[PDB]
């Protein structure tokens, strides 16, 4: 029972205990019988990694130089999980992923096979309604959903499980009732899982559902206070994110360019403060000199836009201040370490001005799994373009890591056309465009390299660290 299903893909199977060898062996056989390139087995139980710094360099030297496409583990309790999952963007999937992938003969979405028990929304395909939210709210809700293991879609389909709306005034509710299953919910559906770390059930679940009688702001505030307000009963899974002094001796200034729904600002404030940091909100009317002189411990600025005048004045007054966005905070929470922004990813800085339009950058992608799908869509978004689920003639670019798969074959053939030519280029073109703030040429040789799986440093997300 053989096939080409896993051609050119490298796997790392982590065995957490001696009793798992039978299953490790099973899984390896299925990978090898279905044409995996490399398949390493590493016994966690059989090597003392205590007092070894299991960081990115250590991982690339132990398990590289070629990229690991998938880690196969039914536990996240290994000391290089954060490096693998949050930095290198390698999916971590259960043994069941291999079994199900062989039976259905396609590369399955990885999210639902994550063994991270924080990934409470792993089974969710969620569309965030842009007509309900400002830009900053949209980014935040996307960050949290991704952090809870869910999938973001830019379209409503039969496969969409949840539509996020602010209120019953969102045009989309009416516009989809005309056309026509999936659930409308308030953003407190996402936030409750983040804060409490358990499935949302009972009366509180009902309070997160769209209610067409919530006709004023007052009724929304009241549901927000019932679902994520002063609970006083504890959060579950208290050891998943054990560093409760993560932001100790740090004080964040919050840009007025964020402009959150007030109860969302309370949630964000409460997040920073429960990790022992401090928050001062800046307003457009503030005299910035006296704010920063009145609270001289302020060491961090949180803003949406890199071109904000507040940020320009702030940098003038406070030249060594940390300059990050809301995504940066949650990345620090993911890593469980305060991390300067220069050691984080491009997407953790306040966003650059719009570089491209849709007409110049409507992109499809292929062979990007899990967090790499998230990362590529965020990057294309902040560049000013659109990213699509499928490859059509509407697409201006196909983004690819390698030469395998059917989308690459079709798109590479379409590149030979004379007039309306789709371009095939690698993900490093997106990253360098953003990093340099320039429309680089995708046909430069460095961006026509499609053998990026030979080096783990060419993983999407590593440009700019």
């Amino acid at each position: 029972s053989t096939s080409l299903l896993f051609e050119q893909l490298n796997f790392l199977i982590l065995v957490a205990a001696e009793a798992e060898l039978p299953i490790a062996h099973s899984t390896r056989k299925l990978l090898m019988d279905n044409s995996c390139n490399n398949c390493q087995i590493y016994e966690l139980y059989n090597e003392n990694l205590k007092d070894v710094k299991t960081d990115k360099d250590w991982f690339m030297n132990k398990f590289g130089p070629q990229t690991v496409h998938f880690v196969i583990s039914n536990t996240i309790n290994f000391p290089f999980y954060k490096i693998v999952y949050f930095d290198l963007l390698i999916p971590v999937v259960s043994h069941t992923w291999v079994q199900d992938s062989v039976k259905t003969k396609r590369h399955l979405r990885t999210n639902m096979y994550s063994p991270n028990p924080f990934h409470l929304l792993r089974d969710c395909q969620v569309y965030i309604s842009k007509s309900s939210f400002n830009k900053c709210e949209y980014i935040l809700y996307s960050d949290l959903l991704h952090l809870l293991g869910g999938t973001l879609v830019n379209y409503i389909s039969n496969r969409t499980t949840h539509v996020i709306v602010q209120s019953p005034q969102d045009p989309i509710i009416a516009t989809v009732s005309k056309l026509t299953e999936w659930k409308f919910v308030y953003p407190i559906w996402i936030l409750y899982h983040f804060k409490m770390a358990k499935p949302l059930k009972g009366e509180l679940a009902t309070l997160c559902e769209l209610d067409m009688q919530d006709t004023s702001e007052e009724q929304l505030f009241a549901k927000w206070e019932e679902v994520i307000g002063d609970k006083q009963t504890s959060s579950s899974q208290l050891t998943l994110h054990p560093n409760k002094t993560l932001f100790k001796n740090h004080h964040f200034a919050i840009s007025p360019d964020l402009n959150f729904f007030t109860p969302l600002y309370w949630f964000l404030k409460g997040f920073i403060e429960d990790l022992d940091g401090k928050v001062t909100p800046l307003s457009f009317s503030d005299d910035l000199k006296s704010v920063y002189q009145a609270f001289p411990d302020i060491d961090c600025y949180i803003g949406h836009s890199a071109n904000s005048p507040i940020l320009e004045k702030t940098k003038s007054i406070k030249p060594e201040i940390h300059v990050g966005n809301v995504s940066w905070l949650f990345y620090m929470f993911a890593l469980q370490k305060f991390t300067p922004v220069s050691q984080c990813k491009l997407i953790h800085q306040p966003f650059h001005a719009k570089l491209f339009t849709s007409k110049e950058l409507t992109v499809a992608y292929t062979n990007y799994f899990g967090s790499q799908r998230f990362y590529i869509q965020r990057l294309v978004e902040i560049l000013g373009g659109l990213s699509t689920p499928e490859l059509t003639r509407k697409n201006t670019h196909l983004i690819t890591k390698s030469t395998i798969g059917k989308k690459f074959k079709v798109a590479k053939k379409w590149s030979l056309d004379p007039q309306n030519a789709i371009i095939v280029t690698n993900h490093m073109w997106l990253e360098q465009c953003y990093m340099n703030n320039s429309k680089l040429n995708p046909k430069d040789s460095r961006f026509q390299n499609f053998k990026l799986d030979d080096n783990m440093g060419w993983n999407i997300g590593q440009i700019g660290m």
Binding site: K130, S131, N134, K135, Y138, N154, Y155, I156, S157, N158, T160, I172, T175, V176, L179, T180, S305, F351, A353, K354, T357, S358, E381, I382, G384, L386
Partner: peptide, 16 residues
């Protein structure tokens, strides 16, 4: 197979 696909807003991420 989609149901609804919103029109893309070119300046959503920069609108004041």
């Amino acid at each position: 197979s989609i149901i609804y696909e919103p029109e893309f807003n070119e300046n959503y991420l920069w609108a004041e």
